[model samples]
Target chain A: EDPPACGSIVPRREWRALASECRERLTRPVRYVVVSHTAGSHCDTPASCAQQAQNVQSYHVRNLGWCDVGYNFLIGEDGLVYEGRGWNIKGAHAGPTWNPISIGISFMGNYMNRVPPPRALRAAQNLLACGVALGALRSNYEVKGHRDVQPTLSPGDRLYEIIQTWSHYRA
Target chain B: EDPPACGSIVPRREWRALASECRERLTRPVRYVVVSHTAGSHCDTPASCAQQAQNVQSYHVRNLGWCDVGYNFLIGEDGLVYEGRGWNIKGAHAGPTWNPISIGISFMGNYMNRVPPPRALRAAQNLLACGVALGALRSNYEVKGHRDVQPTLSPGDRLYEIIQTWSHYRA
Candidate 1:
C-alpha cells in the first residue's frame, strides 16, 4: 500500500519538502514517542501552515545545516498531521540518546501559556492509533514531552501537562 | 529591519514547507480580504493545529494531485497564525472572478455550527492589519465571507454571522 500506517498524514511532497538527506531509519515497532514543540509561530490555514512547515525545514537545513526537517512527524492546531522522518526514519528531533530509540513528534507552536485545541489533541491521539495500526509503533509505546529529556522548555508547560495523561505516557 | 510584515507569522521557512509551485501572484493594494473556513476539523493547540494544517495540504496535493494547497493562508483556533502564500500569491480560495482580486484567508474548520476561538479571531484581525502595514492591501480593505462571493456554505454559518459584525464587513 505504501501509505501511512495511522491517522491522516501529509506526505512530504504535499508540504513541498526538499530532498531529505537523512539516511538512517528506525527499527520497527518503536518503543517511545517523544513530543516536542517548534516554540515558533503557528498557522491555522493550509497556506500558512505549509509555510510554517517550510520555515521549520529551512531553519533545520539552512541554519542547523541538517539533512532535513528533524522530527519524525509534526502536529498543528489545524487538526491534521504532518510526516517528518516518517515512521521508520531516524529523526534529529532529540539527542542521540532518544533520537535512535524513539519517534519524535513536534507541536507547531509554543504551548507554555496556552493549550492545544481539542481537535489538535484528537489528531495526535488518532495519529498514535494509526501508527499502531501500521505496526510502526509498539502496542505499548511510551510518550514523553520534550522537557523530559532535553534541557529546553520545549513542548511547553501546557502540553507537557496533557501528555502525562496519554494512556502510553511513562516517566 | 522591519518587524515581520505579519505579526507572528509562521514563515514558509519555519515550517520546512515544500516549495510552493504556485505561480499566480496577487496584485498589491487589494481592497478585499475574504475570510473562509475549510469546513474541515478544527484544532485546539499548536501541536494539533500544525498536524491539521499538514493533513489539509496532504489532501490537496496528494488526493487531488494539485500543484499546491489552494488557499493563500490558513487560520487556526489554536491562537496562532500560519503562512502560506502570504500576500504574494493569488490563491484559489474564491472562484475565478474573485481569487485574483482578494487576499483569501481561511480558518481550518467547518464553522457552520461553531465559532473560532478568541485567539483565532485576534490573529485574523492582526494579519489584516499587518497586510495594511506592509502595503499588501489598501489602507482600508473590505472584509467578506466565503458566502459573499461564492454560492457555497464555506467559511461556515456561524463564522459568516460573526464576520458580518466586523467593521470591515461589506455584506
Candidate 2:
C-alpha cells in the first residue's frame, strides 16, 4: 500500500493494458533504478496518458515479442504513474544484465531535445520514494540513466541531465 | 591487400593482441557499417594507442567473457586502424541482431565531449572505402551510429554528430 503522501499509480486495468505472460520475479529491496524515456509521444491528461501507456504496452508485447510491457512502470506529463510489470516482476526495459536487479521506469515521451514537464519528473521521484517505503527498493538504491549501464541514449539528454542531479543518482 | 591510397591498419600482432577464440564469419558484401567509440582512454601515439587497443581486447576477453574484442576494427587517435575481428569475421559489438550483419568500427576514446581529430576521422573514411574495394561491404552500404541501431551512446556525441554528416550515413 502506498503512503498517504505517495503519488497515485494507475493500475494496469485502468490503463487498459494487456495481460502479461511474464513469470520472472525480482527480489525485493533492489539496489538500482534505471530511468528511461518512451521515445514516443507525450500526454498530459489522464485519458490521453493512459491511452499512451496502453500503446507502449501493445508495442512491446505485439511487436518486440516480449512477454509484457517492458517497463516496471511508466510516468506521464499528467503527473500519474501507470503500472506495467510493477515492482515485483523483472522488466525487459534494460538489458539482461540489469533487468533482474533494477526497476525500470520510463517517461511517456522522447526527451532528446526537450524536457519532461515538472509534474512528470515529480511523479517519477514520488514513485521512487514510494518504492523505498514499500521495500521494493533499497533506501540507498542508486539511480542510473539508461545510458550509464547500457549503451543507449535513453531517458533523453534533457531528462538524463536532470536525473544526474538527483541525490540517489550515481556515476 | 590495401590499395596504395588506403589507410594503413595495424595488424593484431603489432598490437600484441591475444589470439581470439571467436570463429564467426561475416557474410559479404555486408549491407551495414556501424560506428562506435571505446568510451575509454584516448591514445595519441602509436605505442600508447596500441597499448589501449590491447587493453580494450583484454577487458572484452577476461571481464566480459567474450571471445575477442567486440569491434571488427578499432580507430585510434594515432590516425591508424587497429584490426580486431577484421573484415571477414563477425564482431560482438552492437546487439545480436546487428553484430552479424554490420561491420563494427569503434574509435579509441570517449567522444562525449571531445571529437576525434581530423586524421582519425579520415582513417575511418578510408577504411570504409577499402571495405568496398575489397568486396567486404556493399557499394551502397549504410553507415549507422551505434546509438542509432542499438541502445548505446557509442561513438560518443561529437563523433556521432560527425558520422551523421558522412555520405553513407543513414538516419
Candidate 3:
C-alpha cells in the first residue's frame, strides 16, 4: 500500500520536480505545519499547473542553489496538490528552527488582494488530514502562516486572513 | 513523474497564478512560434512580475472568461521566461490558425516603440532553445510576430523587427 502521506498530492515526477542531492530529513510526527505562498503565478489546468510546479523547482535548484525545492507540498489554484519534498523530509521554507520540526506547505501564488480559490484551500486542508492519518503529524498539530513565524508578509493578506480562520491555525 | 524542464523559467507558482483552471494542450515538436506584447504594465522585479501576472489572469479570467490565461508562456522585462499553458497545450494567443500549431510567447509590456532589455531577449531565446532540447518544439521551428500571422500589432513593431532577424523567423 502507498504511504498515506499527503494522499492527493501530485508527485515530484508529475510536477517535474528537479533532482536534488540534498537529503534533509525531519523527525516523525511533526508538531506544526506552516502555510505560505509563492506570491507568484497561479495556474488553472493540470498541464499548466504541472509546469508551474517545475518552474519553482528550477528556481530553487538552478537559481537559489538549493538542493531541492523549499517546501513539502505545493497547492495550486487549479484545484490540485503538488508534492515537493513530501512528508518526513526537512524543508528550506522558513528559518532554521521551524523548518526542521514543521511541515512547510505553500500556495502557488500571491494572495495579498485576492484570496486563493476554494479548491486550493481544500487541497491544503486535505493534505493536513493525510499527515495526521499517516502519523507524520500529531493529532493536534498546529498550522501557521509564513508571516506568523517569519519576518515577512508572505502567504499574502487575503490568504493570511483566511488561514487565520482555519481550525488549526496558531498565532 | 516530472515534466521536462525549461531552464531559468519562472514557474506559474512564482508569478502567483493565485487561482485558475485548465484549458488545452499542444502536440510535441510544434512547428510555429508567435511573439506578442501585453501592452499593459511592465515589471523588472520578482514582486512586480507577481502583480503583473495576477493582473493578466484577472483580466483574462474575470473579464474575458477564458478557460485560462490566453498565452502558452510569457516573457518579462525582469529577464525571465514564465511558464503559461506550456509546451503541451494549445493557447489563445495567435487566434485559432496559429495557436493550435504554435507556442505563443508574449512580452509582459507594450513594446511597440520600445525594445526589451538584453536579459529579457536572452531569456526568450534561451526558452526556445530549451523547448527544442526538450522536444517540445521542432528543431527548426519557425518564429513569427503576432502581426505576421494575425491581424494585430501584438508583439509591437520594435519587438517584431527584432524577432524577424532571429535565425528561425519566417515571413
Candidate 4:
C-alpha cells in the first residue's frame, strides 16, 4: 500500500469530521488513544502475510469488537495508515478505566521483538499528529505501548525503545 | 488470632480436606494464593497500601466476584490462617494466565511498604509451609508479589525483598 505523503498532516476539520461521524454513528467519544504492536506474533507468518498484512487488521476488528478494529487506526509495515475501529466507540484495547476514555491504535507488526519497519513507525507518527490536529487529542497526549498500562512483554523491546525515544518528540 | 504453633505442619490430606470443603461450599477451585502481612490501613493511606491491603476481606469477596475473599487463605500478623475466598471458585487476585492454575494466599499486612509486625512475617512463613505440606502446591511453585503479575507498586518494596530472601524455601 502506498504510504500517505510524508509530513502531510491530516487536517483537523477532516479528522473531526471523521471523529464526529464515528461518534454520531456509534454513540461514543474518542478520548485517550494508545498504540500496541503485537510482539509475540511476527508479521512474516503465513497468517499475517495473507491479505497483504491485513489479517491482523481484521482480527483486531472482528475478534475484539469495536466499530472497526480495536484501535482507532493501524500502521502497517508497508508504511500505510489503514483505517481501523473508528474513533467513536469505546475500545477494548486498553484497560477498563482507560478504555472508556481513550481510543487505541496498534501497529500490525511485532516491533519490540523485531525491528519495526521504518515506514510503519513513520506512518504512526503521522497518524498521531493527525489525531492531535483533529481535536480527538491534546498535543500533550502521550503515545505509549500496551506495557505502559499493564505488565506484559508486548510491542517487544526493540519497538518499545523506539516508542520511548519518540515519546518526548512533541513533549 | 493465635499464631499457628511454631513449626506446626498440617498434613497434606488435611489441607486437601480443607480445600475440598471450601470448594464444596463455594463451587470454585483455590487459585492465586499469596502470603501478605496485613498492614493496617489506619496509618497507611489507601494509596500507600498494597492493592490487596487497601480493602478489608470483604472487597475480594463482594466486589471482585470471587466465591468469597480472593485469597484461599490469609495469615494474620498473629500467624493464624483465616479462610478467605472459598476454595471452590477461581481467585481474582492473580494475573490472568496464572490465576487458573494457582492459589492466592495473602498475608494480612504490607510487610514491604511498611515494617510488618515481626509476628506477622513469621505467621506468613508458617502458613506457606502449611500450604506446601498440604499438597496444595509444589515446592517449586513461584512465590510472587502482586506487582510481579500486574503493573502496580504493591506488596511493597520491603515485602518483595523478604520474598526474595525466602525464595529458596520451596513447597
True contacts kept of each: 0.02, 0.00, 0.00, 0.00
Structural similarity to truth (TM-score) of each candidate: 0.51, 0.62, 0.50, 0.44
Give the candidates in order of TM-score, highest first: 2, 1, 3, 4
Most accurate candidate by TM-score:
2
RMSD (Å) per prediction: 18.3, 6.6, 13.0, 13.5
| Span of 10 residues, lowest total lDDT, candidate 4 chain B | B12-21
Docking class of 2: incorrect
**lDDT, candidate 4, residue A98?**
62
Model 4: how far residue A163 lies from native, Å: 1.1
Q: Better model by DockQ, 1 or 4?
A: 4
* Top model number, DockQ: 2
* DockQ for the candidates, in order: 0.03, 0.11, 0.02, 0.05
Better of 1 and 2 by DockQ: 2
Provide chain B's TM-score, model 3: 0.94
Tens-digit lDDT track for model 1 on B19-39? Answer: 678887788879988999888
- Evaluate candidate 4 and give its CAPRI docking class based on DockQ: incorrect
Poorest stretch of ten by lDDT in candidate 4 chain A: A12-21
Model 1 chain B lDDT-worst window of ten: B1-10
Query: In model 1, where do residues sit more than 4 Å from their true spots?
Result: A1-5, B1-171
lDDT, model 3: 0.78
TM-score of chain B for predicted candidate 4: 0.62
Q: Write candidate 3's Cα lDDT for A68-166 as tens digits.
A: 889888988755567888887899998997898899999998888999876567557766776775788887999988998889899899999998988
The candidate, 2 or 3, that scores higher on DockQ is 2
